[model samples]
Target: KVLKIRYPDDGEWPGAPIDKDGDGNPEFYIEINLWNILNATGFAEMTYNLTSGVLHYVQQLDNIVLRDRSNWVHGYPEIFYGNKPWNANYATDGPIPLPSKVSNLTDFYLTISYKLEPKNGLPINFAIESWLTREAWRTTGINSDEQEVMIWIYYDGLQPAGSKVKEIVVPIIVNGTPVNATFEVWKANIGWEYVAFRIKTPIKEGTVTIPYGAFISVAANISSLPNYTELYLEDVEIGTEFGTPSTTSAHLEWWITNITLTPLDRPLIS
Candidate 1:
């Protein structure tokens, strides 16, 4: 059995927190983040299986008019691993129950397998966005001094928020096989610093074990960015940002067959 949540077209509802482990504390929060839409005719829905850690999301838009490049993104139907910012309804105990301090993390791996089916080649991007803050579990809302890191696994007819800064290769485990994955790093600042690591070879359907700490280490080495010692990991989200040009209708369906986050406190023997 699965838990299904359907969001209204008006996009006016706050999401819910789910306790996957049967404990009193929640493990994940699913949200319909339609922050950029004003009067769009569309709806989003999500179905999650707590026992298997599987999530499915579907979104549909009809005759919607995106104002310009700045308003291209209509919404993001995502799953949050930590306390969501701005919305205090899903606030957890601390910054996050997982690894909060970057320097203290020995191994942090995100294993995810997903498939995306988009009709009319709908413009979208599948990404993992995480926030790093200087304060400890301070959820006063997003600020200009914080950092936002994004990892784009697959995208079509959509671009990241910043310019491509550099390229680097990170070690990953794909289907139990070790391989070096290359990614293009992009950065920009619209009040807060935004950094994106887009995979050179996109994965439309497959399982990939990502060494998340490597990406964090790279972002911390940037010239003007905050140091890893001072930054605490906050929310870690995986979702698709969908939208189309003016007067264009779009449809997208995606599924995360399995997703797991492991915070290994010791060095990986492999």
Candidate 2:
């Protein structure tokens, strides 16, 4: 049986006598740097408003809203990222401040990988929707020439790696049926639906509304999430937006159940 390692309570070996592979070099890899070593570490910290408000984590819909999440930074460096190379002075910011106060909203970003059951040779529509508000525009930096609006995001023909996007971009039907029924389109000015160009897929604009008829404090945290999953996926790329850059720190599966996979172009968080 392999022997397990014993660590000291203070997490330091200080000047402890060394042992080697019967050679007396230095049993502790620190002195020898033999094969690479692996360590397990984990950390997650969060703070709640703890105050009763209309926009708190409402259980009725499993969503909540707060003025700020400034306190979510506690316990971050130690518990989760131990032994890993991280900087104390690093100041990279966190997620975009997404609104959680919709009276009737559904399907925020996919916190988990969803399975798309087969549909007869047509593009399967899986709508990812969120609520934006008028308050988010005036108070925050987001633009707002329109009233309240819904944000719809999804992928079409997603088969492992080779999938294109399909949208009900217009209220038009093809071959006798509506092509994009995944999301409902409301009109503009008086709540009309029109597409805006961002040169970005998940178009960012100052005109799109925030949620729950209110604005938030931070804009850097809205689908701009980090480390949301403990489980890693392979082959697929994920970024702050959609097409930013490539880093293998995490992965998402493309096609499973053995459907002869083709390569895909992973965009950065565009």
Candidate 3:
């Protein structure tokens, strides 16, 4: 059987802590954060299959007029491991505990397999958004030392929040086969540093293992960002940020077959 969580019609945030493996201890938390459309009407929901560990999400917006890119994103249906800095009330202890000091970890990796189906090729981005902070404590708002890192796997008719600053090819494991993936780095400073690594060749449906440390190293080298050694990996999330060009209805269906994060005390040999 599949369990489902729908967007609350009265503008309440709907969420739940899921123990995917049925081990009693919650390992992940799923939420429909509709902050961007808090005053708008919409239909969004997330369904999860406990046994298969698959998460499916579908969203359709209504009664909202999106005139520009500023409020383009209607909402985000996300599944995450660890505490979300934006919302302190929602968190999970984790099957894999996060908030690890970057300098202390020898290796950290994220593997995910997903597929997306957006009607009329809607503007959307499938991304892994993680937070880095100088300290490890949980907080409700942004911190002065906080940095946002995003890795974009798939996108259509949408761009990252900043300008393209650099491009680099990094070796990654795709379904166990090593391959070099090209990523265009984008950066912006909106009170805090925001860095995004967008894959040149988007993966619409496939499994890919990303070395978290590699991306962090790249971001740290940027002049405006802080050194990676002093940061803490606070949260890791997988979700789709979607929107439309004009004030019309749009829909998107996304599925995640598998996702996992592994942190090691030894270097990862690619």
Candidate 4:
């Protein structure tokens, strides 16, 4: 596990590496990027344990924004990253080379066990984001955009990024738990479709199976999705986003056993 803090003095991306193995490779990395209306002094802390698979995130703010702003951080743990699944130039660096396109995808699954807790009764809004992207060739420069399918495993008072244009409720079993899934589609930026999912009955601690392709299928339903069929599956990201009350903080622990993006030869549609 590691803790990351960002103060007002540093202007650049403030973060440190938690090299647990000591063999040069760091198990986890954290970066703090926060912006508020007030110019007060505050700090943000993030703890991630690769062995334990637990993340403890806490922040204390004095001056903050009354409205929602792009204020958040990423707790990047070196989970299993696949080869470029899409048409990305394998040589590209910095923004991370992406996998092949989604049209070339099949059954995608992520099974994780986690415990979610709120310090002050859900003071901040947070959830896991499964970010997927398809960028232009490296010669064109990186674009700050991608088709993101966000899963709100734990949210108190906020909606996913973008505008809600469609909603659906489906019953699905994950990790042997039966729950009704509320899937919604938003007119995301750049005319992309932001497919978001929220469990009707929120789960604090439990083992859940994330069938990514199901949600991807939801995004496929939206006609606005770029390239529609040929859009490639760039990357799969799982992170938290915090919102509300300046002094808000929370604790989250996630342990992923298996994550695979393989072919589904079985019949999914009759």
lDDT of each: 0.73, 0.19, 0.76, 0.47
Candidate 4 local lDDT, 142-163, one digit each (tens): 2344565566655555555667
Model 3 lDDT per residue over 89-122, tens place: 3345544557777666556778998888988767
* Clash totals for all candidate models: 0, 39, 0, 13
- Per residue, candidate 1 scores C-alpha lDDT tens digits across 85-151 of 5565343432326426666545568888888887897778888988877776656766777788888
Worst 10-residue stretch by lDDT in candidate 2?
A: 53-62
Deviation of model 3 at 178, angstroms: 1.8
RMSD (Å) per prediction? 3.3, 21.6, 2.9, 6.2
Candidate 3: residue pairs that collide: none
TM-score of 2: 0.19
* Reference-based lDDT, residue 178, model 3: 94
Query: In lDDT terms, how accurate is model 3?
Result: 0.76
Supply candidate 3's per-residue lDDT for 10: 26
Question: Candidate 3, residue 14: CA error in Å?
Answer: 1.3
Q: Rate residue 165 of model 1 by lDDT.
A: 90
Candidate 2: C-alpha lDDT: 0.19
- The sequence of per-residue lDDT tens digits that candidate 2 reaches over residues 59-166 is 010112212232111110110100111111111111212222222222112121222222232222222222233332222322233222223323333221112222
**Model 2 regions more than 4 Å off:** 1-110, 135-154, 157-270
Candidate 1 or 2, higher TM-score? 1
